[model samples]
Target: GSHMTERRLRVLVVEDESMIAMLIEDTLCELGHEVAATASRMQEALDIARKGQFDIAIIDVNLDGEPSYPVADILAERNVPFIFATGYGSKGLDTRYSNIPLLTKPFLDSELEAVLVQISKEV
Candidate 1:
């Protein structure tokens, strides 16, 4: 038999909108990943970022008009891998995030799978 399955990854999804967040959960499952947690509000995102357990995070660039950069900062401090989701593209990112990975804003399952594989490769 061919060995095709990758290790399952637990993921966090941080987004302000419910539909997009829900869709992401489904996409993660379509691959082989599990949903560790999800946050849709500013405080929820930060608090979850502190104590949440997951292999990586997919965060929206803006949450209720406020940038999720603070959450990204916390994730960075925790040594967790994170990718920001936005149609804004790299234009919105600081140069420091040059190494970070991302999925297109209106995420495609194909792109999502690729990004997950990129991170899952290291662990």
Candidate 2:
């Protein structure tokens, strides 16, 4: 039964822009992964992450009122790996999350795919 299971990776995408979120979902789908959910706010992202068994998460560093790092912390505690996204530079990221994978804004789908593929291998 375990071996028969679909090996599709489940991803939670956190982005304030609806179009970008959809694009990320499409990219993930093309890569044989599943889009678990897409959130525009930190709270929404956290709520979904807390409830779902996501294989990985791609979250923006800053949301309207809260930072996505909190959700990243929660996911880390749960042993779920995640990558951070930023329209801004990575200079301000807190030290704890500095070493994690990051995707800068306006990045290409190929870049995201490369990172996800490597991360999946790690998992």
Candidate 3:
């Protein structure tokens, strides 16, 4: 088990569902990370990804029907660590980005924290 620390991370959360977005926000806050920004649309998320300053991001695979790959691409180019949070399962993700971290929907806080910790350590 991991011990708690004083480190604070800035995170960008992208989710189309209002309830789920709030849940993720709460979980990230409980985990000691700041929600730098939250976007519920592809274009809005892309704008933030291009201009926002943050340590990492949690992106939804799809914004309704809009794919979040563009936002993911921008983050990759910026060398920022990110995880795809999706309800469509891993199979729904692009194979090119298969190696990035993933957080399946309907996850517990522990699961979200585990991934946050894992990515935090990597960066």
Candidate 4:
């Protein structure tokens, strides 16, 4: 592959699982992005989504047994683009968000990188 300059994005991570969140944080750092904030609960994510400064967000579909669509909605309202990650696959996502890209859990680092690259183009 030819060498290409990439823009580092400020990112928001919303995941309730501690280990998974850390893994993602490491991956984001490896990919040259900065984590603006990390949220583990719905309200916390929503608060950050509304006021945090970030280029994009990676949101877990379910946060501690509650659907995270509210956070997604808030981010959308804030004009932020985000990728949804879920262990339960597409069927677990709300139909209202059918258009958003869904990253099935256990996704490869390359997949996450590709998504970040794609989303960065929109910024």
Candidate 5:
């Protein structure tokens, strides 16, 4: 935490809940970052995770009851950093991912911004 220059981040949002997506999108924009794209399906997210143009991602732990860990695996191999935002819902879950930042439901914009900065430290 020596110093962090103000920076704009491109974020890929993978959430099936539209309302939640909007909520986080507002926080992202307000944080001076860009919402590169929002994917509502696990399949779509996997594709994006492979070829998406973004510095990072905010992925839902569940996509309408289905685990979104497939997308996480793709991002993992791609060497792209991501955060998992859960509404309360994983097990192909590698233990290493335990190190990734996680935001439980009802978290604040400030919380999200803090995690984003926390990840930037590794970048």
Candidate 6:
């Protein structure tokens, strides 16, 4: 079992773009947080998240034209926190989940940090 001190604020990255996932993972590492994992497929992302051990996640609104709402719902059910890093903007989100924290694509590291800070407060 991992001890609390060994835990580095685990963050799951659920995005289809390999470059983007790498960028976010690197950023999280630089921030002294752990990149628990990254998943490009909806099923993969959902399955990884269902394990329910991550502290936070950065999810894309769409995963190869399929919506990631189901995965988001699973995260919510487990009380796991996450932020939507969407290229499709807020319009891409379902009405019920619209108010959740969202980070537009091409966001800088500071923007991501801000989003995480906001989610930490809310979630």
After superposition, which runs of candidate 5 have C-alpha atoms over 4 Å from their true positions? 1-6, 67-69, 73-79, 86-101, 109-123
lDDT digits (tens) for residues 41-123 of candidate 3: 66656655766545545565654543556656445444343445544433333322233445544556536445544533333
Query: What lDDT score goes with residue 118 in model 3?
Result: 58
lDDT by residue for model 5 over 45-83, one digit each (tens)?
A: 665566655555556665455445765544444443444
* All candidates: TM-score: 0.55, 0.56, 0.56, 0.55, 0.57, 0.56
The true-versus-predicted C-alpha distance at residue 40 of model 5, in Å, is 2.1
Stronger candidate by TM-score (3 vs 5): 5
Let me know the TM-score candidate 5 reaches against the reference structure: 0.57
* lDDT (Cα, tens digit) per residue for candidate 2, span 7-117: 677656665577457667677666777566575566757665776545555565554433566665444344334444554433333322232445555656535444544
Positional deviation of residue 84's Cα in model 1 after best superposition, in angstroms:
2.7
Candidate 3: residue pairs that collide? none
Sort all candidates by TM-score, best to worst. 5, 6, 3, 2, 1, 4
Kindly report which residue pairs in candidate 5 clash with one another.
none
Top model number, TM-score: 5
Off by over 4 Å in 6: 1-7, 67-69, 73-80, 87-101, 109-123
Identify the superior model by lDDT, candidate 3 or candidate 4.
3
Candidate 5 weakest lDDT stretch, 10 residues:
89-98
What do the candidate models score in CA lDDT, each in turn?
Answer: 0.53, 0.54, 0.54, 0.53, 0.53, 0.52
Error of 6 at 103 (Å): 2.7
Clashes by residue pair, model 4: none
lDDT of 6 by residue, 15-117 (tens): 6566457766677665677656564556656655676545555566654543456665444344333444545533433322232545545556535444444
Runs of candidate 2 with Cα error greater than 4 angstroms are 1-6, 48-52, 63-80, 87-101, 109-123
- Candidate 4 regions with alpha-carbon error over 4 angstroms: 1-6, 67-69, 73-80, 87-101, 109-123
